Design an enzyme around this catalytic site. Sequence first.
Site, PDB file in Angstrom:
ATOM      1  N   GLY A  78       0.830  -1.188   0.000  1.00 25.16           N
ATOM      2  CA  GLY A  78       0.000   0.000   0.000  1.00 25.16           C
ATOM      3  C   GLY A  78       0.868   1.243   0.000  1.00 25.16           C
ATOM      4  N   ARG A  82      -8.014  -2.372   0.117  1.00 15.48           N
ATOM      5  CA  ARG A  82      -7.607  -1.176   0.853  1.00 15.48           C
ATOM      6  C   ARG A  82      -8.037   0.113   0.144  1.00 15.48           C
ATOM      7  NH1 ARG A  82      -3.090  -4.735   2.583  1.00 15.48           N
ATOM      8  NH2 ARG A  82      -2.902  -4.350   4.839  1.00 15.48           N
ATOM      9  N   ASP A 122       5.768   0.257  17.101  1.00 14.41           N
ATOM     10  CA  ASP A 122       6.070  -1.102  16.658  1.00 14.41           C
ATOM     11  C   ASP A 122       6.963  -1.849  17.644  1.00 14.41           C
ATOM     12  OD1 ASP A 122       4.620  -0.713  14.274  1.00 14.41           O
ATOM     13  OD2 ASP A 122       6.380   0.108  13.255  1.00 14.41           O
ATOM     14  N   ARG A 140      -2.082  -6.564  18.473  1.00 15.86           N
ATOM     15  CA  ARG A 140      -0.822  -6.999  19.069  1.00 15.86           C
ATOM     16  C   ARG A 140      -0.881  -7.055  20.594  1.00 15.86           C
ATOM     17  NH1 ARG A 140       3.536  -4.190  14.812  1.00 15.86           N
ATOM     18  NH2 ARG A 140       3.635  -6.063  13.486  1.00 15.86           N
TER      19      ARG A 140
HETATM   20 CL    CL Z   1       5.142  -3.748  11.671  1.00 18.02          CL
END
Ligand code: CL
Length: 445
Positions: free
Chosen positions: A96, A124, A319, A350
């Site tokens: 993307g 997307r 991240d 996550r």
């Molecule tokens: Cl990532």
Amino acid sequence: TQQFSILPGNKAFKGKFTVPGDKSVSHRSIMFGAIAEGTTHVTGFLEGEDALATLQAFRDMGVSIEGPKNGEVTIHGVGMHGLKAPASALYMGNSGTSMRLLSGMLSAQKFDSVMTGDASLSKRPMERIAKPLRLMGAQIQTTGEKGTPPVSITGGQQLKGIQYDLPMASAQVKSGILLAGLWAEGETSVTEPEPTRDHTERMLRAFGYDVKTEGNKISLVGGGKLVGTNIQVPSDISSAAFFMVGAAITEGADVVLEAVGINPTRTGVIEILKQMGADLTVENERIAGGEPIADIHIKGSRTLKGIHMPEDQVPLAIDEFPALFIAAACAEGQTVLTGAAELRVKESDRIQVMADGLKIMGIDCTPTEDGIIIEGKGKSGDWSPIFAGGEIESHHDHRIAMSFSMAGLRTSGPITIHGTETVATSFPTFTELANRAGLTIEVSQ
Ligand SMILES: [Cl-]
Ligand SMILES: [Cl-]
């Protein structure tokens, strides 16, 4: 499927290492090297999903490129107007990022283009970048009501710079607009409501383009020119972070990570670890390819302690929190994360995946709406095992897998991590560096 296996026992964790090149910066060097005057030589290059799709795109548009080979790429730039029409659709795969940044660039070209993607990218939406480009005078068609790919662009337009207040923060949309602005008449300006990474802006400056960063207002004037140069890609701090954590939780550890990129929009893990009482120094600071780098020296000289993680560092460490959760578990006392709602279900939760794995390993934690609470099992001066081990699901999230790999440094039982095959794509030398450090990881079927 692929899995990592780690055995319990007292590990050593020491050495001098250099992690792979920054993913994003590697990509930008291609974007601008292609349209710059003269040759560009890139070193420390890491080819990811974004780089390969963009590499092919510029090859299709007539650019001669040697490599990548051993982290080295030579780009024979063709100038601001040297791109040639692609003979067919430009396939972006799952990138993307490539599609959004090239949208801006392609909307300014003399020729037409169509950008297509795989099954995932086809879903997307692309209207957040398409909309501002249309205001600049671009002719850009998207598919259906959600405005998904294919993205069909009509060239031969005269673009005009706009002053754009970005409804939703995005380095990709920001970058797309600025890139179109390189060919546009007048000044193109983007005002982001929240701070984002600036690898695009810095790379533009490295190639000799003037870009004004004035608070949250980022702008340039079109008609300028890019000049080919030598680009040393900084090593990825997101990759380095795992070894920072590993060193900080391992008794007597002594790790030097060389030439780690310390772009202030990326250094949240450093500040957070420092606030957790980590023995972590930043020395030998210099700049390479418009990016700041430094050597990170981490020692396991003392026990981390749990903190209310600083909210002003969350955007800068987004991240790296999976890795930081491992540190929090080995820390003394409670750790609390807030204002990280973005971290939940960002097309992959996550917080929960880490929570599941942590709980399996015997860590009391609790997902919240904007973060998580972790009860650290650490004790000052004590370096007995923190984790119980067990079978872990990474859900093919490389950052989850690599995070729980570090847990093997303080485990009383075997660890088996499932779905680790994407680790090598993101961090090719991860298991190699782990082994060289003293953390043996066995890869299997
Ligand atoms: Cl990532
Ligand atoms: Cl960026």
